[model samples]
Target: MLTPAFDLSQDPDFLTIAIRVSYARVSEFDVYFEGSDFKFYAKPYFLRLTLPGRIVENGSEQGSYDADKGIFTIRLPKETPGQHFEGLNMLTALLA
Candidate 1:
């Protein structure tokens, strides 16, 4: 059981104001040491933008996962004027 690590400074692309929406994939690797088998799990991620001190709407979209790389990607629509986007702040994973 290992936790994933992330650094905001490493990905400057996620901080752009022009972004209409930001998407992410939270993934985890399930290890079965006794059975010698490993499995990957993932879920859809999303971010919404709101004016300072205002409520923001949540967005969602279908996403796919790659067991081999333990990664996922989301493509957002073109940016709309006057909207601000935020990056993912936290992620968590659970194993069964």
Candidate 2:
């Protein structure tokens, strides 16, 4: 029933990433932190939208998803201290 509509933000130690899906609906979706990474399939809509930037396995929270407004966002923590996490396209991420 949960589906991702968007993904990232910023913070002191963690990058705040927006999530529009539910952990329970992961099988239906292909978004981040299904134990790692930043891109995945979205859509209980029969289509997949790729989100950018990888994520940590564990974040400060699971994030918030508002079904009525469809305003969902998640915060992903960074790997290294003071490190910046950015979104990478599949081509860019794969080649790099």
Candidate 3:
């Protein structure tokens, strides 16, 4: 499996991840967000991240796949509404 190019962004209440998997198919991937852990998997791609802050499955978490651009966007609500997570840009450190 390969690690696709991805970017992370954030707000006080949420953390957003935009992943680019050029060869990925729609609806074929599985994503999981547990506490501070993030996981994604598809046929030939996989990603696992240990986030700097906690996240919860509060029913407000969102995900969208754009076949046009082969991208997956995920929004996770933070455990603490106003907590700010750091090191979002430090990709290697997020590896689990």
Candidate 4:
């Protein structure tokens, strides 16, 4: 399984979570998500994401699509709030 990697950025506003990934068919992926850590699993291909901070709740997320850009984006919202990431961890190498 080829894991999908991504770019993540968040505002300290304590509610908005933004993520973007490069893939033509990214919208087709189920995400199979639960928490801020977009632990997505799509059968043959696997994608896992972990957030440093936390969100108030789950499933209040939405996806946006740009046809020409070929980008799939999801902005996660929280009733409560959240925060980067780092290196030096071997798991960083395992991240995909």
Candidate 5:
């Protein structure tokens, strides 16, 4: 099982923003069991926001994962009012 924790706050620029977040787990079982030195394989997980209905510009910062704590962080750009901002927005993560 995997769990995630993150922080989402209004960008100081005062733009509406939403973030969808998720994570993936990597373990060293498959390769280790096969008697190979390599133990773990990298798997991909997804996370995203579904509010404001459209895709928000992703920030320059890329997504990152921490193996020690099992956490992933993705930076999303803030929403401009003149831009698209609508619907029931929520942040969620899908783990595999």
Candidate 6:
């Protein structure tokens, strides 16, 4: 499997990850998040991210796909609201 290119951004309450999976089969996408570990898989593309902060599945998570751009944007809520995370722009540190 190949690791896709991705970027990160955040707000006081959430972290957003933008991933590029140009050749992935959209319907086959799979995602998992627990604590600081995040994972995504779709055919040949597999992405694993170790975030700087913890996230929880409290029915507030969101995600979207941009067919025109071949990108996936996923938003996860922080375990501690208003907490600030560091190193969001350091791609190498997020790899797992």
User: Ranking by lDDT, best first?
Assistant: 3, 6, 2, 4, 5, 1
Cα deviation of 55, candidate 3, in Å: 0.7
Candidate 3 has what TM-score?
0.84
Model 6: what TM-score? 0.83
User: Could you tell me how far off, in angstroms, the CA of residue 35 lies in candidate 3 after the best superposition?
Assistant: 0.5
lDDT per residue for candidate 6 within 2-94, as digits (tens), equals: 556578898898988898877865566888889888888777676777888888787678889887988889898989978867877774542
lDDT of each: 0.27, 0.48, 0.81, 0.47, 0.34, 0.80
Clashes of each: 0, 8, 0, 1, 3, 0
The residue-level lDDT of candidate 1 at 67 comes to: 51
Give lDDT tens digits, candidate 5, residues 1-96: 442343443332222322223334345212111111112233553233333333235345334555565443433344343443332334443445
Query: C-alpha displacement of 69 in model 5, angstroms?
Result: 1.2
Candidate 5, residue 71: the lDDT equals 47
* Pairs in clash, predicted candidate 6: none
Instruction: Compute each candidate's TM-score over C-alphas.
Output: 0.25, 0.49, 0.84, 0.52, 0.34, 0.83
Q: Is candidate 2 or candidate 6 better by lDDT?
A: 6
Query: How many clashing residue pairs, candidate 2?
Result: 8
lDDT: worst 10-residue window of model 6:
87-96
Poorest stretch of ten by lDDT in candidate 2: 87-96
Global local distance difference test of model 1: 0.27
Which 10-residue window in model 1 sums to the lowest lDDT? 29-38
Give me the overall lDDT of model 2.
Answer: 0.48
Q: What is the lDDT of residue 96 in candidate 4?
A: 33
Best by TM-score: 3
Query: lDDT, candidate 1, residue 21?
Result: 18
Q: 41 in model 3: Cα distance from truth in Å?
A: 1.0
State the local distance difference test value for candidate 3. 0.81
